[PDB]
Write a protein that binds this ligand. Structure first.
Ligand SMILES: Nc1ncnc2c1ncn2[C@@H]1O[C@H](COP(=O)(O)OP(=O)(O)OP(=O)(O)O)[C@@H](O)[C@H]1O
Ligand SMILES: Nc1ncnc2c1ncn2[C@@H]1O[C@H](COP(=O)(O)OP(=O)(O)O)[C@@H](O)[C@H]1O
Lengths: 155, 155
C-alpha cells in the first residue's frame, strides 16, 4: 500500500492526482478516483476496463472528459498505476444531502467495505471531497489537497 | 516486437486498433498510432508522456478525443503496451498533397528513420492511411483494415 511505496513514488502519485483534480474541479468535470490500500478491491467492483497505466494527470483528465468512453464509473489506482477505469461499486444504502449524487453514494459504498480512499469531483459544482471509512472530507482550498490526501493515505 | 508476440496477443492488439480506428475515422478525430518493430524509437521522439498502459480501444479513443491533453501528437505501441502518448516526431520534409496535414508528415518522418508501422486518421476527412518505409497505403474500406495491418506487421 501507499505507506510501503518509496517517497518519490508517494510524491508522484499525490502530485499527479492534484493536477488532475485541479483541472477537473476548475472545469466542473465529474470524477471518481479510488485508491486501493490493504483491502483488495478486485472482488468489490464490476465491469470496467483494465488500463494498467502509470499514473499521470493528463491521462486522468482525458479519462473523465464527456467525449471519453471511460468517463462513467470509477478509476481504481493501485500503487502508482491507474489499474481500472469505468468500474462500478455497490452504492451505499445511506442517504446523503441533496447536493450529493450517485458518484458520492458510489464512493461511500466502496469506503464502507474497504480501507480505500476515494476522491470525488462533483460535476455540478466542481466540489472535491475525499471519502474514507464512510466519512466525507471537503477540500475547499485545493492548495491543501496534497496535504490532506497524503494524511489520509497514511492513516 | 509484434512478430515476437503470440498469435493470440497479435490478434487482440489488431482488434483493439481496428475498433479505435473505426471510431476515430467515423467521428473524424485525428490520430497517429505508431507500432514499434525492430528499430527502437525512444531517441526518435520528443516529449509526450510515458503511460506504459495496456492496449485498449476505449483508452485510445480517450487519448485522442477533443479535450484530452494527450491528443496532440503520437501514441507509440511497444509489444503489447502503449508506451508513450502525445509524443512528437521529426516531420518529413517531403511535400504532400493538400489532403494531408501535419499528422501525415509526422508519420512519414518516423517511417523514414525506422521500420515502424504507423496508422494515421485524418481529422479533416476521417481517411485512414498506414505508413511504412516512407510510403502511404490508403485504407478506404475499413473492413479490410485488420487484414492489411496484420500483413504489414508480419512482412
Ligand atoms: N512532429 C509531430 N509529431 C507527431 N505529431 C504531430 C507532429 N506535428 C503535428 N502533429 C499532429 O498533427 C496534428 C494536426 O496538425 P494540423 O495541421 O491540424 O495543425 P498544425 O499545422 O500541426 O499546427 P496548429 O494546429 O498548432 O496550427 C496536431 O494536432 C498534432 O497532433
Ligand atoms: N455504482 C457506481 N459505481 C461507480 N460509479 C457510478 C455508480 N453509479 C453511478 N456512477 C457514476 O456517477 C456518474 C453520474 O451518476 P448518475 O447516475 O448520472 O446520477 P448523478 O448525476 O445524480 O450522480 C456517472 O458517471 C456514473 O458512471
Amino acid at each position: 500500500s501507499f505507506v510501503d511505496l518509496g517517497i518519490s513514488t508517494q510524491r508522484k502519485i499525490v502530485y499527479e492526482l492534484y493536477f488532475a483534480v485541479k483541472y477537473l474541479s476548475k472545469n466542473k468535470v465529474g470524477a471518481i478516483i479510488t485508491l486501493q490500500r490493504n483491502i483488495l478491491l478486485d472482488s468489490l467492483r464490476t465491469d470496467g476496463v483494465k488500463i494498467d497505466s502509470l499514473i499521470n494527470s493528463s491521462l486522468l483528465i482525458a479519462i473523465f472528459q464527456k467525449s471519453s468512453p471511460l468517463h462513467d464509473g470509477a478509476v481504481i489506482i493501485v500503487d502508482d498505476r491507474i489499474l481500472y477505469a469505468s468500474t462500478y461499486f455497490s452504492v451505499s444504502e445511506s442517504t446523503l444531502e441533496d447536493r450529493y449524487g450517485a458518484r458520492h453514494r458510489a464512493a461511500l459504498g466502496i469506503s464502507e467495505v474497504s480501507d480505500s480512499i476515494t476522491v470525488v469531483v462533483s460535476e455540478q459544482s466542481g466540489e472535491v471531497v475525499i471519502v474514507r471509512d464512510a466519512n466525507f472530507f471537503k477540500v475547499t482550498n485545493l492548495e491543501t489537497f496534497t496535504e490532506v490526501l497524503t494524511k489520509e493515505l497514511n492513516s
